Design a protein around this ligand. Structure first.
Ligand SMILES: [Mg+2]
Ligand SMILES: [Mg+2]
Ligand SMILES: [Mg+2]
Ligand SMILES: [Mg+2]
Ligand SMILES: [Mg+2]
Ligand SMILES: [Mg+2]
Ligand SMILES: [Mg+2]
Ligand SMILES: [Mg+2]
Ligand SMILES: [Mg+2]
Ligand SMILES: [Mg+2]
Ligand SMILES: [Mg+2]
Ligand SMILES: [Mg+2]
Ligand SMILES: [Mg+2]
Ligand SMILES: [Mg+2]
Ligand SMILES: [Mg+2]
Ligand SMILES: [Zn+2]
Lengths: 122, 53, 120, 216, 114
RNA sequence: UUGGCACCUCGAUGUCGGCUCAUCGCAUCCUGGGGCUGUAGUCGGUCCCAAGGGUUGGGCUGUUCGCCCAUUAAAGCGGUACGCGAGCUGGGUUCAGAACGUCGUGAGACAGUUCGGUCCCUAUCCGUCGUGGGCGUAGGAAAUUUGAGAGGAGCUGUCCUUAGUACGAGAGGACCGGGAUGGACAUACCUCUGGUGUACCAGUUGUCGUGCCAACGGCAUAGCUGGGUAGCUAUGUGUGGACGGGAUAAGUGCUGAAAGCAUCUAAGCAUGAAGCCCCCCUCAAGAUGAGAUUUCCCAACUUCGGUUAUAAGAUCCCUCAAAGAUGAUGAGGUUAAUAGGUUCGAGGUGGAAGCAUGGUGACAUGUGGAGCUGACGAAUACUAAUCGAUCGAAGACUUAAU
């Protein structure tokens, strides 16, 4: 459950370390986003030397949430953290490596390259 | 807030239409014949349901 | 369960007091709602007494008050001893229903429905 | 188009054919009997009157609704049936397909049927505008003395009145509610139960009416 | 019991091939991934931290550390999506719900074996 | 809007902005339907119909405005005492303090600034939201109902396909049609995920008790902590705005004269919007126009107008909950499972006490998924719903037909 001002870890080597959510995309008055949704965010913390810089306004796909997700079979998955991956306009990642597990819902989201790079897909 | 106009006798008594009490729910005690409250011990003889209390 | 116009601790205390007093006197006058709550407490205490084992006795001790009963023979016994002695022996063959409540009518001071609750 | 009366038993779940979790409501719909048959000729409209859940026979000093009174007993004995707890009309059915006295078994519905379910929603007693009408609270701090109030009820000199339909505190629930386009998940004729997909209005033991969904 | 009718209509959903286990036991849950038409088994190995509910509604939760990130999977105990469950290890715990593990990492989070 | 006037109010008509709650207009921001286009397509421009619904979060500033960030189909303009302070706030502004600049000899002053600075009221009437009683509805009753009216709802994105087709040098790229899946909103509901869960279980500190040990109780926010049943719940789970019909608006026409032609119009016949009337959901016969169907009760006495207690039925009183402020509603009242108890379970907790064993000991292990357990399921008259009482028909007249 990601809303404006929620902070998230970046699960990639794009250069951004922590982002703040500026907007949940996908409709007027949409309050919260979950795994597989795209957000506008600003880079609050970055590694020196990265491609993405502090203060950049970027778009990210949420890949892990503490709230988790429910699946049609009545099972659930929940994570210890809220993580997202900075993306380009074509849903491809800005970085080259993904860190930590990702939910399978990204596949239905068509974030195929993120899914492929992820160390584990759950 | 305060009453803008005093209340006429008519209006007051209309309002008091339903302000009243009822006769108690009472029946004759089968033991001693004195009235009692239904489902209560009879205070006259101390009987209830054919036995002394 | 009723709240009986008291906080949780006060209600617990009052129900223990009433249960003990009903064990002692075998019949007590009280308000209707109090009697309808204390009947359950007292009858569960009767159940413990009828079970009779040490664990039952200690469970009962958690609830009963520490009161001394002076018997007719100048002998004394606690409420817990009375419960696990004469009351339990009395109700050995009765399955529940150890109390009855007899409505008496409203009292003068406040109109409360006075009732008698007694064992048996 | 079909119809039946049951009691809400409760909710549970079943696993579908692909393992999907389907929440279901269990409706016990035993002892449905066609008590009366209404026609345009006599009543001005077509409908079947259905009685549900036998109650006990008339007795002299009955004190509750458990025992049928004489009017109800006569009405039911005309249909040859035992007196019933609930009686409701279905106008959505074809009267010519029913006989007075006929049983209405749960088997009239089949798995996959799309249905409207009608009940009386749970009562909530006297409720305020936030709960009853979903209004916004005032601030809880910053000097506010407005938390759960209903807000302005009109304007000023124009209109010097509160309009009908103003939302205010009052009794909540206990209303007839129809939930449309539910689905019959399962019919168990041995237990006389229907498993309906989703949730339906009313408390447990509450009367529910199941009809073929009006929209199609 | 629960309501007789509920139990009667849900009885045939219950599976009988499930090993006994308790919170604190380490499980390997073989889960059927049916992506498209291909079907495969993915194993989730972790500690049982929670079991709740009854009948067909009963659920359980297994916790794992993946790439340094805790992950919890909750399953309906009788879901047909589980091929099987293997009890890999019996843990020694003192309570039904091991929520305190969510806040522990590393050697602090280890469960003693029976 | 800035003003002009000074007609109501100075024995007081609270004043900016915001919050809560809206309501109306249309001069329409989006969506729907059209004409023209310097409309190839995709986009646009302009005008016409159209008010059903919809019409966002933030930064700055008291601000309204306005600018900016990021969205959206869109981020409409106005009225309602610049709607709404006996509904809230009180940041601005025009009380008393103090200070700067300025003016003034001064006291002081300034639509200059700055820091600080008391927002009362138990609702009588109408009004509005709920909820009862009376009488009426030409006998007295129990159910099921028609629907005159009224209220609700009414929004929309994206993607796939048609089709890389029509159109276009190219770039790009459709109408119409067919599918899928979302946002916001509404409603029901607790199986699931969670919250709460003050008479559920467990751990633990201090201290005071139950003579001591052991085991327990009180108080310390429920002492604190870890869990948690029912109920109530959203952020959770379902469902909805679907499909259509009739009449229309702007329009588009057909046939067609006045006016030998022409012409959508005069007569006549079609077609045509998210709009109108329905369709869908809810209330509804005090609809005094008081409707309908099924069933139940039906005698004596009479000044023979009428009366009567009774009937069917419903209550008082009592046990209650799915209902509830109280009434009311609903489950029951011995020919009884209504509640309590009791017994057995579910779910919850997580291994009681006692004893035994192993340790110097703190503890550990066994007996033993143990002990306990509110609300949830079942069974059982053990307790209490006793004994009683009250209300409640005899069916007006006229005409027509039979
Ligand atoms: Mg205390
Ligand atoms: Mg708010
Ligand atoms: Mg306050
Ligand atoms: Mg005056
Ligand atoms: Mg217009
Ligand atoms: Mg004014
Ligand atoms: Mg104003
Ligand atoms: Mg005012
Ligand atoms: Mg101020
Ligand atoms: Mg000077
Ligand atoms: Mg729930
Ligand atoms: Mg439950
Ligand atoms: Mg003390
Ligand atoms: Mg000690
Ligand atoms: Mg003290
Ligand atoms: Zn007497």
């Amino acid at each position: 459950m990601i809303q404006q001002e929620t902070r998230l870890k970046v699960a990639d080597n794009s250069g951004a370390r922590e982002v703040l959510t500026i907007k949940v995309l996908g409709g007027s008055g949409r309050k919260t986003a979950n795994i597989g949704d795209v957000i506008v965010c600003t880079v609050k913390n970055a590694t020196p030397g990265g491609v993405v810089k502090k203060g950049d306004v970027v778009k990210a796909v949420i890949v892990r949430t503490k709230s988790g997700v429910r699946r049609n079979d009545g099972s659930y998955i929940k994570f210890d953290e809220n993580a997202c991956v900075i993306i380009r306009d074509d849903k491809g990642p800005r970085g080259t490596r993904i860190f930590g597990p990702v939910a399978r819902e990204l596949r239905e989201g068509n974030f195929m390259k993120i899914v492929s790079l992820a160390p584990e897909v759950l | 807030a305060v009453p803008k106009r005093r209340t006429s006798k008519t209006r007051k008594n209309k309002r008091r239409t339903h302000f009243k009490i009822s006769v108690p729910g009472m029946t004759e005690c089968p033991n001693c014949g004195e009235y009692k409250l239904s489902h209560r011990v009879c205070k006259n003889c101390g009987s209830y349901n054919g036995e002394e209390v | 369960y009723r709240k009986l116009g008291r906080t949780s601790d006060q209600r617990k205390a009052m129900l223990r007091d009433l249960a003990t007093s009903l064990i002692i006197s075998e019949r007590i006058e009280t308000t209707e709602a109090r009697a309808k709550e204390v009947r359950s407490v007292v009858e569960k205490l009767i159940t413990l007494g009828k079970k009779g084992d040490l664990a039952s006795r200690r469970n009962a001790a958690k609830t009963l008050r520490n009161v001394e009963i002076l018997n007719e023979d100048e002998t004394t016994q606690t409420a817990l001893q009375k419960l696990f002695g004469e009351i339990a022996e009395r109700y050995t063959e009765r399955q529940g229903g150890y109390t009855r409540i007899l409505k008496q009518g409203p009292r003068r001071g406040d109109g409360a429905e006075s009732v008698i609750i007694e064992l048996v | 188009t079909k119809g039946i009366l049951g009691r809400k038993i409760g909710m549970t779940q079943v696993f579908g054919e692909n393992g999907e979790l389907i929440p279901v409501t269990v409706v016990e719909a035993k002892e449905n009997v066609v008590l009366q048959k209404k026609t345009v000729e006599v009543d001005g409209y077509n409908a079947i009157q259905v009685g549900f859940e036998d109650k006990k026979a008339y007795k002299k000093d009955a004190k509750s609704n458990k025992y049928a009174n004489k009017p109800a007993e006569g009405h039911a004995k005309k249909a040859d049936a035992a007196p019933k707890r609930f009686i409701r009309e279905f106008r959505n059915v074809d009267v010519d397909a029913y006989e007075v006295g006929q049983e209405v078994s749960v088997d009239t519905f089949v798995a996959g049927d799309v249905i409207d379910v009608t009940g009386v929603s749970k009562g909530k007693g006297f409720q305020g505008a936030i709960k009853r009408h979903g209004q916004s609270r005032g601030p809880m701090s910053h000097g506010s003395h407005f938390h759960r109030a209903p807000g302005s009820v009109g304007m000023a000199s124009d209109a010097s009145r509160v309009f009908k339909g103003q939302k205010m505190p009052g009794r909540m629930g206990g209303n007839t509610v129809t939930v449309q386009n539910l689905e019959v998940v399962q019919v168990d004729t041995e237990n006389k139960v229907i498993l309906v997909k989703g949730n339906v209005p009313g408390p447990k033991k509450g009367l529910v009416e199941i009809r073929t969904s009006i929209k199609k | 019991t629960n309501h007789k009718l509920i139990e009667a209509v849900t009885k045939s959903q219950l599976r009988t091939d499930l090993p006994s286990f308790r919170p604190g036991d380490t499980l390997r849950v073989h889960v059927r991934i049916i992506e498209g038409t291909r079907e495969r088994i993915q194993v989730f190995e972790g500690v049982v931290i929670k079991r709740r509910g009854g009948g067909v509604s009963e659920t359980f939760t297994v916790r794992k550390i993946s790439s340094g990130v805790g992950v919890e999977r909750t399953f309906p105990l009788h879901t047909p999506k589980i091929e099987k469950i293997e009890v890999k290890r019996r843990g020694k715990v003192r309570r039904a719900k091991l929520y305190y593990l969510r806040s522990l990492r590393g050697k602090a989070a280890r469960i003693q074996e029976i």
